[PDB]
Design a protein around this ligand. Structure first.
Ligand SMILES: CC(C)CCC[C@@H](C)[C@H]1CC[C@H]2[C@@H]3CC=C4C[C@@H](OC(=O)CCC(=O)O)CC[C@]4(C)[C@H]3CC[C@]12C
Ligand SMILES: CC(C)CCC[C@@H](C)[C@H]1CC[C@H]2[C@@H]3CC=C4C[C@@H](OC(=O)CCC(=O)O)CC[C@]4(C)[C@H]3CC[C@]12C
Ligand SMILES: CC(C)CCC[C@@H](C)[C@H]1CC[C@H]2[C@@H]3CC=C4C[C@@H](OC(=O)CCC(=O)O)CC[C@]4(C)[C@H]3CC[C@]12C
Ligand SMILES: CC(C)CCC[C@@H](C)[C@H]1CC[C@H]2[C@@H]3CC=C4C[C@@H](OC(=O)CCC(=O)O)CC[C@]4(C)[C@H]3CC[C@]12C
Ligand SMILES: CC(C)CCC[C@@H](C)[C@H]1CC[C@H]2[C@@H]3CC=C4C[C@@H](OC(=O)CCC(=O)O)CC[C@]4(C)[C@H]3CC[C@]12C
Ligand SMILES: CC(C)CCC[C@@H](C)[C@H]1CC[C@H]2[C@@H]3CC=C4C[C@@H](OC(=O)CCC(=O)O)CC[C@]4(C)[C@H]3CC[C@]12C
Ligand SMILES: CC(C)CCC[C@@H](C)[C@H]1CC[C@H]2[C@@H]3CC=C4C[C@@H](OC(=O)CCC(=O)O)CC[C@]4(C)[C@H]3CC[C@]12C
Ligand SMILES: CC(C)CCC[C@@H](C)[C@H]1CC[C@H]2[C@@H]3CC=C4C[C@@H](OC(=O)CCC(=O)O)CC[C@]4(C)[C@H]3CC[C@]12C
Ligand SMILES: Oc1cc(NCCCCCN2CCOCC2)ccc1Oc1c(F)c(F)c(C(F)(F)F)c(F)c1F
Ligand SMILES: Oc1cc(NCCCCCN2CCOCC2)ccc1Oc1c(F)c(F)c(C(F)(F)F)c(F)c1F
Ligand SMILES: [Ca+2]
Ligand SMILES: [Ca+2]
Ligand SMILES: [K+]
Ligand SMILES: [K+]
Ligand SMILES: [Mg+2]
Lengths: 279, 391, 75
């Protein structure tokens, strides 16, 4: 109840991403106008990011595990109301969750060092998802109240499987790579879109003071998106709020092509058997 | 206004404009007919819809989602919907994939290569494919060598496929790729060739015509040398007589180090040498492939043959302790003490001069910082020499 | 002496190769053929430069006759 605090969490992410963009752009321009130990540090981070060493091997697997772990936390939290207050010391969750986001913060640091052009590293999908997911947790632990804002973006981390698998030298052929890429991209897109619809629908429209909210659960949202993406369209469940419809238009523009071009390829790639092998 | 000159831009603009115009116009017509009523029924059949709702209705209809949340109720509305269903569905089916395809033609491998102070790098160009790259890397980065710092920079003309991408990922630190061509004098500057240790040139051994390949490689060499006069170059060649053409380049200084390799000459040479003593070819060809020790238990000839192939050949300077000594004495001393086999030494003088085997007395050790060749298991063990104090 | 002063005239089928004929040249794939050093020295030659002869023939009456007399020696 009381005054809504959603503005703060959205603010914290925004200031970081833009503020980081400003300082880097400024520093480059400053050096233009005015006119090794560092190399060793960059080399060590690059070796650690890849799986060259044993220490590299263990770290990558942890990212693989914790990426799934953070997602499972999101599913559990979806049932709770959008805005709520909780004690940090009392709850088992929000303590495991706090632990995970510490790790993602460090792995961002190492990834940052090894980049070549800091600007085009900053404007990367993994960097931006980290920007929009990490600071809100700290803001929430400080303010003792939480908002389910943008947390659905955690599903986007599934993209990196195709690479953190090749680093371990498991995928070698030219078919397993294709299959893994297709599967990961498809599933990640589906889940993140469902999460966004869930957020927008359960919340009301802001200018209408949240008076037209419609109640839905996450599984229902997933089901709705699958039905729409397959171009079946039962009339039982459909988006009602303005933002929901607006998003659904663009998703109809994109996801339909995605599905109709991807599903046959996966079906074909699987099942390529030698029907007369044996001995 | 000359803003559009290419073809993809024109195609994309045409498609976008037609699609958006059709969508909005049809939405407007539905808005009019639905907000008004049928005339013959004295406009008693009206329904209330906003323009945005009409836009939403058509997108669902064209996509064939058919949610059914909102729908037309008037006679004119239904008639127009029937005809538009006949017409616009083909447009939606055959336009959206086209736009999605036309966007997304991004060249992943543009850009340049930053230069790291205090670290050398090389550039490789020519016939690049999975087998050649894998062999080259596997041999070049082997661990029997002393620790190395050089960074490899490929440069080809065809974008790589998935397996080659995976290989580059597995060697993420030391290998970088760029797309271009050697003959363009912009790409050379783009890969910072003016400060580079050397430049290798692989060649396609399995070719349809040997001479065309030689001409192409000569063209690459002359272009590179034109861009930069003094740079080490190593090249493969397929015919013996074509080697003379290299000397015609005004700046091909082999004396300071610029080596060409003629496969046919070397192959025939190995075979001819084998005609004297059998097996010499297969015994020599193993001295240039970096391999590590392999140990097995079953008492088969492999158990000895692998110990044989574990050797390689290196080079290093000699310690000052061997000033006034005969080559045989030095060789036997090195053998018995260090467990190293010293096969041949070069002779430092005003001209280049290498001797294979030397009888005593004929040539005492010059000790002019002389360079000696060796055979050993790995580069580390050679450094046992050059340290020989009275320990 | 050496063989750097031997007069040579060569014919090319693709203009862009002209950069290879000389060593102390400012090679670049953008300048048109009529600016490259080999051409202005009257050493290279390509058939591509004769496409311009069409329009010149239409306007002036009988240039084609003049060129033939001056070149092939008797028309
Ligand atoms: C492998 C990873 C990606 C998980 C994949 C499966 C999840 C999508 C499923 C598996 C079990 C599901 C859970 C099973 C049971 C519950 C309890 C259920 O409880 C209520 O309805 C509480 C109502 C309230 O008190 O408000 C809420 C959904 C939830 C957390 C489900 C959320 C979705 C979960 C995590
Ligand atoms: C897609 C990106 C660019 C984000 C866009 C967000 C906006 C659509 C939201 C964010 C904050 C919202 C505002 C937050 C709070 C308010 C106050 C709200 O009024 C009240 O709270 C009480 C009014 C009364 O007393 O009746 C009216 C809507 C408004 C301006 C909202 C309008 C819609 C805004 C600008
Ligand atoms: C560019 C992308 C990334 C975001 C697009 C956001 C828009 C879809 C939002 C942002 C602000 C919204 C507006 C904010 C407030 C209002 C006023 C609202 O009316 C009232 O609050 C009272 C009306 C009355 O007096 O009856 C009607 C919707 C409208 C125009 C909203 C329509 C939808 C808007 C334009
Ligand atoms: C295919 C493999 C990976 C197993 C996948 C399991 C999920 C599809 C299951 C596990 C737990 C299930 C959930 C457990 C409990 C609930 C609450 C349940 O609540 C109601 O009945 C609400 C009212 C209604 O919709 O009838 C709705 C379904 C849901 C979300 C279930 C949806 C389907 C879930 C996520
Ligand atoms: C826009 C261009 C393509 C011309 C289209 C002409 C027809 C397709 C439409 C336009 C106006 C319509 C007329 C508008 C109003 C009426 C009156 C309507 O009767 C009444 O409303 C009660 C009697 C009266 O109003 O006098 C009967 C149909 C009729 C003749 C309509 C018949 C069909 C008409 C001729
Ligand atoms: C093919 C496209 C381009 C135009 C299609 C036009 C038709 C849908 C319209 C044109 C004239 C209309 C007719 C004009 C007048 C009448 C009389 C009307 O009779 C009454 O309701 C009695 C009172 C009155 O006359 O208004 C019943 C509908 C009907 C047959 C209308 C049916 C619909 C019609 C055929
Ligand atoms: C996907 C892109 C390329 C096209 C999307 C088209 C429609 C989804 C949008 C784009 C612009 C929108 C319009 C922009 C502004 C206005 C004015 C706006 O006017 C008011 O709010 C005033 C109301 C009053 O004064 O009573 C009403 C909605 C409307 C027509 C909007 C209707 C919906 C439109 C056509
Ligand atoms: C082009 C892209 C980036 C945005 C397209 C939408 C926007 C141009 C905004 C600006 C004004 C908005 C409109 C302002 C007010 C209204 C009235 C509002 O009325 C209702 O709530 C009706 C009941 C219902 O929608 O369930 C419905 C949404 C609508 C048409 C909004 C739809 C979205 C609009 C067109
Ligand atoms: O969606 C919003 C949700 C909330 N708080 C929800 C809880 C409200 C109070 C509790 N509820 C009251 C009664 O209902 C049930 C309980 C606040 C502002 C929002 O506004 C957004 C927006 F306008 C927007 F455009 C975008 C986007 F487009 F950028 F994505 C957003 F992400 C937004 F979050
Ligand atoms: O549709 C029409 C609308 C109007 N405008 C006035 C409506 C006044 C409504 C008053 N009401 C008060 C209370 O409720 C709210 C509104 C006039 C004629 C029409 O008739 C057409 C037609 F019959 C036709 F065939 C074609 C075409 F397609 F052939 F071109 C048309 F374009 C038409 F416009
Ligand atoms: Ca070895
Ligand atoms: Ca030249
Ligand atoms: K339906
Ligand atoms: K359909
Ligand atoms: Mg690097």
């Amino acid at each position: 109840r009381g005054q809504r605090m959603w503005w703060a969490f959205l603010a914290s992410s925004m200031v970081t991403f833009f503020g980081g963009l400003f300082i880097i752009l400024l520093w480059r321009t400053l050096k233009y106008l005015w006119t090794g130990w560092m190399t060793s540090v960059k080399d060590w981070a690059g070796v650690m990011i890849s799986a060259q060493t044993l220490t590299g091997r263990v770290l990558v697997v942890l990212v693989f595990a914790l990426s799934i772990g953070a997602l499972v936390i999101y599913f559990i939290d979806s049932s709770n109301p959008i805005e709520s207050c909780q004690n940090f010391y009392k709850d088992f969750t929000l303590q495991i969750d706090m632990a995970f986001n510490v790790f993602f913060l460090l792995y961002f640091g190492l990834r940052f060092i090894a980049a070549n052009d800091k600007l085009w590293f900053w404007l990367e999908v993994n960097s931006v998802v980290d920007f929009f997911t990490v600071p809100p947790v700290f803001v929430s632990v400080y303010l003792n109240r939480s908002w389910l804002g943008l947390r659905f973006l955690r599903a986007l981390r599934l993209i990196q499987f195709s690479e953190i698998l090749q680093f371990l030298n498991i995928l070698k052929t030219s078919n397993s790579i294709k299959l893994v890429n297709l599967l990961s991209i498809f599933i990640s897109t589906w889940l993140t879109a469902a999460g966004f619809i869930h957020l927008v629908e359960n919340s009301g429209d802001p200018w209408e003071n949240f008076q037209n909210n419609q109640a839905l659960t996450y599984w229902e949202c997933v089901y709705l998106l699958m039905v729409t993406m397959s171009t079946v369209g039962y009339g039982d469940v459909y988006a009602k709020t303005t933002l929901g419809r607006l998003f659904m238009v663009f998703f109809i523009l994109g996801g339909l092509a995605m599905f109709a071009s991807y599903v046959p390829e996966i079906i074909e790639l699987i099942g390529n058997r030698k029907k007369y092998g044996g001995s | 206004l000359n803003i559009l000159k290419t073809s993809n831009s024109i195609k994309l603009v045409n498609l976008l404009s037609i699609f958006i115009s059709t969508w909005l116009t049809a939405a407007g017509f539905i808005h009019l007919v639905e907000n008004s009523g049928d005339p013959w029924e004295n406009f008693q059949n009206n329904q209330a819809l906003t323009y945005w709702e009409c836009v939403y209705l058509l997108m669902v209809t064209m996509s064939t989602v058919g949610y059914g949340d909102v729908y037309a109720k008037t006679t004119l509305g239904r008639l127009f919907m029937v005809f538009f269903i006949l017409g616009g569905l083909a447009m939606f089916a055959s336009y959206v994939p086209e736009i999605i395809e036309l966007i997304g033609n991004r060249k992943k491998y543009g850009g340049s290569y930053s230069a790291v102070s205090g670290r050398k790098h090389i550039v490789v160009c020519g016939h690049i494919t999975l087998e050649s790259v894998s062999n080259f890397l596997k041999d070049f980065l082997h661990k029997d060598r002393d620790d190395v710092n050089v960074e490899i920079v490929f440069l080809h003309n065809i974008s790589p496929n998935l397996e080659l991408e995976a290989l580059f990922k597995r060697h993420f630190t030391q290998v970088e790729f760029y797309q271009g061509s050697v003959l363009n004098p912009h790409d050379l500057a783009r890969v910072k060739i003016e400060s580079a240790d050397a430049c290798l040139i692989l060649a396609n051994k399995y070719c349809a015509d040997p001479d065309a390949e030689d001409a192409s490689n000569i063209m690459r060499v002359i272009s590179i040398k034109n861009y930069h006069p003094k740079i080490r170059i190593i090249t493969q060649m397929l015919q013996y007589h074509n080697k003379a053409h290299l000397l015609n380049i005004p700046s091909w200084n082999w004396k300071e180090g610029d080596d060409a390799i003629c496969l046919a000459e070397l192959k025939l040479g190995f075979i001819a040498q084998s005609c004297l003593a059998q097996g010499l070819s297969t015994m020599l060809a193993n001295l240039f492939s970096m391999r590590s020790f392999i140990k097995i238990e079953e008492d088969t000839w492999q158990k000895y043959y692998l110990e044989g192939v574990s050797n390689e050949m290196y080079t290093e300077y000699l310690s000052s302790a061997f000033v006034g000594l005969s080559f045989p004495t030095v060789c036997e001393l090195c053998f018995v003490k260090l467990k190293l086999l010293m096969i041949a030494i070069e002779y430092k003088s005003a001209n280049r001069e290498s001797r294979i085997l030397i009888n005593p007395g004929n040539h005492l050790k010059i000790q002019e910082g002389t360079l000696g060749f060796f055979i050993a298991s790995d580069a580390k063990e050679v450094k046992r020499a050059f340290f020989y104090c009275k320990a | 002496t050496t063989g750097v002063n031997i007069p040579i005239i060569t014919e090319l089928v693709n203009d862009t190769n002209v950069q290879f004929l000389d060593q102390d040249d400012d090679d670049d794939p953008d300048t048109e053929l009529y600016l490259t050093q080999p051409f202005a020295c009257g050493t290279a030659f390509a058939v591509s430069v004769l496409d311009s002869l069409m329009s010149a023939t239409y306007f002036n009456d009988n240039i084609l006759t003049l060129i033939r007399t001056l070149v092939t020696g008797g028309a």
